[PDB]
Design a protein around this ligand. Sequence first.
Ligand SMILES: NC(=O)c1ccc[n+]([C@@H]2O[C@H](COP(=O)([O-])OP(=O)(O)OC[C@H]3O[C@@H](n4cnc5c(N)ncnc54)[C@H](O)[C@@H]3O)[C@@H](O)[C@H]2O)c1
Ligand SMILES: NC(=O)c1ccc[n+]([C@@H]2O[C@H](COP(=O)([O-])OP(=O)(O)OC[C@H]3O[C@@H](n4cnc5c(N)ncnc54)[C@H](O)[C@@H]3O)[C@@H](O)[C@H]2O)c1
Lengths: 341, 341
Amino acid sequence: SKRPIRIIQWGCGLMGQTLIRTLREKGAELVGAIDHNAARRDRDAGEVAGLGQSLGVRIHPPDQADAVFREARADVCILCTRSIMSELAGALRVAARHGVNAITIGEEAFYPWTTSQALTEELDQLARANDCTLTGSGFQDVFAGNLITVLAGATHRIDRIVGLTQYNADDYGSALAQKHGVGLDPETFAARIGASNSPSYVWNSNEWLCAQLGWRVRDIRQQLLPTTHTGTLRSASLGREVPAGHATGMKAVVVTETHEGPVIETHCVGKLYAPGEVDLNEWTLRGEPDTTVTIRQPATPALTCATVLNRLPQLLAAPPGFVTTDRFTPATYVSRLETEA
Amino acid sequence: SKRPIRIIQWGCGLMGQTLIRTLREKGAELVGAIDHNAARRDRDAGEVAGLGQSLGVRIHPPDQADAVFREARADVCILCTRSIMSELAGALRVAARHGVNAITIGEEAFYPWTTSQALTEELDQLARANDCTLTGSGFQDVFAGNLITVLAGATHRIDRIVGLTQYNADDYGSALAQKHGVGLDPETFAARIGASNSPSYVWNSNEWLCAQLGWRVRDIRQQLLPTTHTGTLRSASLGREVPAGHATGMKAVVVTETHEGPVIETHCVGKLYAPGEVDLNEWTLRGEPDTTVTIRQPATPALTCATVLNRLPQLLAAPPGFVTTDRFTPATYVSRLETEA
Ligand SMILES: NC(=O)c1ccc[n+]([C@@H]2O[C@H](COP(=O)([O-])OP(=O)(O)OC[C@H]3O[C@@H](n4cnc5c(N)ncnc54)[C@H](O)[C@@H]3O)[C@@H](O)[C@H]2O)c1
Ligand SMILES: NC(=O)c1ccc[n+]([C@@H]2O[C@H](COP(=O)([O-])OP(=O)(O)OC[C@H]3O[C@@H](n4cnc5c(N)ncnc54)[C@H](O)[C@@H]3O)[C@@H](O)[C@H]2O)c1
């Protein structure tokens, strides 16, 4: 027989709400929900996710996470909270301590082996010790990952891979807007965002490409610059107007050099959109031959969530540890989130 | 403890010439060459492939194929000759009888399990008896194959996959132009091409998609129509002028219906090009979300040959038999075509 995959949603904001709705559509069961947001604490997860029915799954604050793991008998925790390993590791450790597989959309977690080596190695040991799998997925998994490596499989010689990924700061929560300097004046942007130069999502996803292609990274250079508009734009996530000339978000340019020779140059743009702007995804493999792929207006949030749910059967089957998706076969379409009973 | 992969090129026309040059750039060695073409017979394969320096590999006629396989001690035979299994079987039997892995760009061979079931089962048993693997690859492997299934892994619900593939009937040899009815008057086209309704490349590649997605085919419907131009066009492959109103090639529409419900609808055009026409590759996964992917002017011949060479390490490692690429992980970029001792 088959049974529902049993999921704990940790982070019940925009992406977590989409996942609660879509996991139920595919026959999975929400068995726990954790969020620290004062407005969502104590509410039913079905209500917060916009469903027509109460699920009888109360949103618990993270200080009660152990009790929800013990009670829930979950197969997997999906973690949609923060972007950087230091801010994900706490939740991933709770999942691993309970022997529960976890998959996060936190962008650094896609490939954190060099940017947060100590935390990743510690979680890898802890996941191995508790016979469960931790991984990072989301939009990058295909759209800055296997889309490129599938095309590399048809390429004679790669000299350079050149990428552009653009997403709408207002499709996501305050964390993403903050990381992108949305609403900062030019000086504060340069001082807080530019100067600290924290790895953009494509620093890690470029490393993921090199790992899957069998290349060794020899140098990484990133520049973070503010984006701008000629008019006022509004950030719904931060609930403030952004004057013309203030940062509407940021453009990251990452150049990843290899010992082998090929280079990966990726532009990563997260900003408020002026009228008629849309998400972009375009890659060129330069060499023999040159190949250019364009996704026409990728539905970035939907593609992020669908990839996570399609990964779950593989996550359940995966060997224990912190296992990044460069070590998996590509996500396949799964009609039903049901598992052998 | 590694050595060059040893290749026999069977078919030294346009694709075979590209393969002889490219295989060497990736570290493989040409150990045999077969072609029935009176103009290439007895010439050096390096010379025919446009190299500056002779390789000391004479092109042999296929009546001498056994003797060249016995001498060559090949790892792989690349077969670039004909399109349909009945016309490839002769060469695939020679490869298999000599324990040599074979990969063909013959379009039916991509997924021949239902269109040529008996030949496929016969070759499977012959390959298993000789500890070697036969497979079909080429442009379809990614561009009507794993490009679609990688995007399916980011999709919540698939209702329909709709594809358009257009290629230049003049980039390939006479066999492809003939399969497409190039230069036929409308009556002869109807009588020979339209009426027989032989499987277009996307009949087999849509079956390949269903196999990889875990769908069961319930019906396949194809219509073949001639393409036309308003002016005379020239086929370099046939050395023929094609007057306005004669078939410049053919457009296939294949609708592949599954038991599960999703449908794959693929439009496939192979023809002579009027001024400004280019190759096209565009796919839409309709459902949730809708995703459209476009390849800008794919370098279809270069992509065909590069995919074949990238597949070779997998072909060597593959279990014995007729093993279609739906059973492999996607082709990966290979810098070095080497194998153990
Ligand atoms: N493709 C991708 O990988 C991808 C795409 C979408 C979003 N993201 C990332 O995922 C995260 C969530 O995005 P979102 O748009 O849903 O944001 P959101 O702000 O709408 O977030 C979900 C919730 O997480 C809560 N939260 C944060 N830290 C928590 C913790 N330790 N414990 C409990 N609750 C916690 C917040 O209160 C919020 O309610 C962000 O870091 C974003 O950058 C990644
Ligand atoms: N992506 C793909 O899968 C793909 C793309 C390119 C070509 N093809 C197919 O592959 C074939 C080769 O294409 P090409 O452009 O190299 O054509 P080509 O005419 O240049 O082919 C090479 C030569 O093979 C010879 N040949 C045919 N049958 C033979 C046999 N039994 N023994 C020895 N030699 C034989 C022919 O005389 C021909 O000149 C065509 O049928 C074409 O339709 C498929």
